[PDB]
Amino acid sequence: ENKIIKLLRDNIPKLQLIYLFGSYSQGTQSDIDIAVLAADTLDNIARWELAQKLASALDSDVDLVDLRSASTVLCQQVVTQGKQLWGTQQDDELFAVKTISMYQHLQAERQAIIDDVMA
Amino acid sequence: MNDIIINKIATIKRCIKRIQQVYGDGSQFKQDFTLQDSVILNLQRCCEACIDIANHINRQQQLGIPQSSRDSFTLLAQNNLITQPLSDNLKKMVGLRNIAVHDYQELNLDIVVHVVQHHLEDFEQFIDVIKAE
Amino acid sequence: NDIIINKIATIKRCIKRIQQVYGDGSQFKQDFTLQDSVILNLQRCCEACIDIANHINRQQQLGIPQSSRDSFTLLAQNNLITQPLSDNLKKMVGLRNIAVHDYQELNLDIVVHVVQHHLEDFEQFIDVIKAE
Amino acid sequence: MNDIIINKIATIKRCIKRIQQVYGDGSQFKQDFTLQDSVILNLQRCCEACIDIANHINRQQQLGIPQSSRDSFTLLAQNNLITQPLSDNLKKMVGLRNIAVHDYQELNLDIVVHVVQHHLEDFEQFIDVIKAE
């Protein structure tokens, strides 16, 4: 039942995004969480319209995430729990060392805020 | 006949009337969460109402058992009750139950502005098709 | 609050540090030593604006930043800085991220353009919190 | 070896030359703030590339992941990939980096002059230890 849905979630992004870099499965394995990287940022509406087009081609809801505009915490959640579906490996490592290093710096910036919230 | 569809059709018109009023001309909406929270909430009340009407029509005419909320609109279009471009737009709304129960604010505020500007008339269209009778 | 008084001073000092280094400036795009200085102090102004943004966020409880850009949106979410101002400082965090983390090549034309017509955003930011 | 490691090693050896070109000797360093800025930035570029190298091997070899910049070196040391002294030297560089970029302390300039005199080999050891690999 899987994979045949994966390459379904491959054909649609490869055919709907210019300059596709990588495709990721994120949340679980219902509900589907998909992340994607391209050479250009995605339009807010055009991404959602495509996300709803992914959600209709499949049966579940779909959250399409633009990795060129997503938050640093969300990017770390993708490199931590995730599965690469399409793209090279040198672009995958480039995106991981970028996010992990940016995350270690963010943790240093917001730890005073995190501690106040967590008492 | 019957009461539950005429009350769900009436609610869709009430929520459209509300979204049109709370959103206003669109200026204050972008920087007022109270204006956003109302429009978002009244937007969710339309989606569940159409999904209720869709699941009802599939039940009364035995068009099938909808496995999802989107699949309920598919059976209406597959039996040619609604046009397939109209089902896609209503299925676009099915995934709009996620702007609420998620205060991820600015990421999809431009999207609710899109559906308020361009997609409220998909609910008016859907209830007009039901009105026949 | 004794810290915001300081970070405003290093923002002011780094802006002066940027200006005297840029010169006229013609030697800029050919001298890599003074490009490094302009780049460094531009980065210092960003991290000194983020610190001011995060201290106010912990003094008021505005949220939890999901990125360095998020620290300025929380100020615009509560109408403390103008929405086009938070967008301009978020454009600085982008420049600051490319200089710190090497996830692109540094476009010098942007640096020259930021030095010419964007340093006012640092002045406008420290001019707020003066303190409304 | 890897496409990312060869580029980071090339960035470190590039900035090492830039640190050594701007300095030599302190004939005008401690009196020229611009020379001080051009050395601190390439010290950061050297430091960040090592942090980027550390975070990669931690992910590529399943022994990660660190939560801090220092824990990436601390992690490469526990697995006997870099020498524990060399690990502690690189982490104390991040201290020099943070103190210089956003000063939570008065930057002691005698430490910066000392580092470019005795600690630049720590980056040279690191890229050699990683080129083994």
From Swiss-Prot, chain A:
Report the top EC class in one word: transferase
Family to which the UniProt record says this protein belongs: Belongs to the MntA antitoxin family.
What positions carry the motif GSX(10)DXD motif? 22-33
Xref: PANTHER family: NUCLEOTIDYLTRANSFERASE (PTHR43852), PROTEIN ADENYLYLTRANSFERASE MNTA (PTHR43852:SF2)
Q: Which UniProt keywords apply?
A: ATP-binding, DNA-binding, Magnesium, Metal-binding, Nucleotide-binding, Nucleotidyltransferase, Repressor, Toxin-antitoxin system, Transcription, Transcription regulation, Transferase
Residues given in the record as Mg(2+) 1 binding sites: D31, D33, D63
* Molecular function GO terms recorded: ATP binding; DNA binding; metal ion binding; nucleotidyltransferase activity
What remark does the entry make about the cofactor?
Binds 2 Mg(2+) per subunit.
What job does this protein perform? Antitoxin component of a type VII toxin-antitoxin (TA) system. Upon overexpression in situ or in E.coli neutralizes the effect of cognate toxin HepT. Neutralization is mostly due to tri-AMPylation of toxin by this enzyme. Successively tri-AMPylates HepT on 'Tyr-104'. Binds its own promoter, probably repressing its expression. The TA system confers plasmid stability in E.coli.
A Pfam family matched in the record:
Polbeta
Q: How does it assemble?
A: Forms a complex with cognate toxin HepT, may form a homodimer by itself. Forms a heterooctamer with cognate toxin HEPN with stoichiometry HepT(6):MntA(2). The 2 MNT subunits do not contact each other in the heterooctamer, each contacts 3 HEPN subunits, blocking access to the toxin active site.
As cofactor, the record names: Mg(2+)
Its EC number(s): 2.7.7.108
The record's section on SUPFAM superfamilies has: Nucleotidyltransferase
The induction comment states: Expressed during exponential growth, part of the mntA-hepT operon. Under autocontrol by MntA.
Recorded phenotype for the gene knockout or disruption: When mntA-hepT is deleted, has a sight reduction in swimming motility. This gene cannot be deleted when the hepT gene is intact.
Protein's name according to its UniProt entry: Protein adenylyltransferase MntA
The text the record gives for the protein's domains is:
Has 2 alpha-helices that are important for interaction with cognate toxin HEPN; deletion of helix 2 (residues 52-65) or the C-terminus of helix 4 (residues 114-125) reduces antitoxin function about 100-fold, while deletion of the N-terminus of helix 4 (residues 98-113) reduces antitoxin function over 1000-fold.
Organism name? Shewanella oneidensis (strain ATCC 700550 / JCM 31522 / CIP 106686 / LMG 19005 / NCIMB 14063 / MR-1)
Q: Per the record, what are the reactions this protein catalyses?
A: L-tyrosyl-[protein] + ATP = O-(5'-adenylyl)-L-tyrosyl-[protein] + diphosphate; O-(5'-adenylyl)-L-tyrosyl-[protein] + ATP = O-[5'-(adenylyl-(5'->3')-adenylyl)]-L-tyrosyl-[protein] + diphosphate; O-[5'-(adenylyl-(5'->3')-adenylyl)]-L-tyrosyl-[protein] + ATP = O-[5'-(adenylyl-(5'->3')-adenylyl-(5'->3')-adenylyl)]-L-tyrosyl-[protein] + diphosphate
Q: Which residues bind Mg(2+) 2?
A: D31, D33
- Alphabetized InterPro entries for the sequence: NT_sf, Polbeta, TA_antitoxin_MntA
Q: Which gene encodes it?
A: mntA
Swiss-Prot record, chains B, D:
Q: Which GO terms describe its molecular function?
A: endonuclease activity; nucleotide binding; RNA nuclease activity
Q: What induces it?
A: Expressed during exponential growth, part of the mntA-hepT operon. Under control of MntA.
Give all O-tri-AMP-tyrosine modified positions. Answer: Y104
Give the keywords, sorted.
Endonuclease, Hydrolase, Nuclease, Nucleotide-binding, Phosphoprotein, Toxin-antitoxin system
Active site: which residues?
R97, H102
Q: What does this protein do?
A: Toxic component of a type VII toxin-antitoxin (TA) system. A bacteriostatic toxin; upon overexpression in situ or in E.coli inhibits cell growth. Cells swell slightly. Neutralized by cognate antitoxin MntA. Cleaves mRNA in a probably endonucleolytic manner; has no activity on rRNA, tRNA, ssDNA or dsDNA. The TA system confers plasmid stability in E.coli. Neutralization is mostly due to tri-AMPylation by MntA.
State what protein this is by name.
Answer: mRNA nuclease HepT
InterPro entries named among the record's database cross-references: HepT-like (IPR008201), HepT-like_sf (IPR037038), Type_VII_TA_RNase (IPR052379)
Give Gene Ontology CC terms: toxin-antitoxin complex
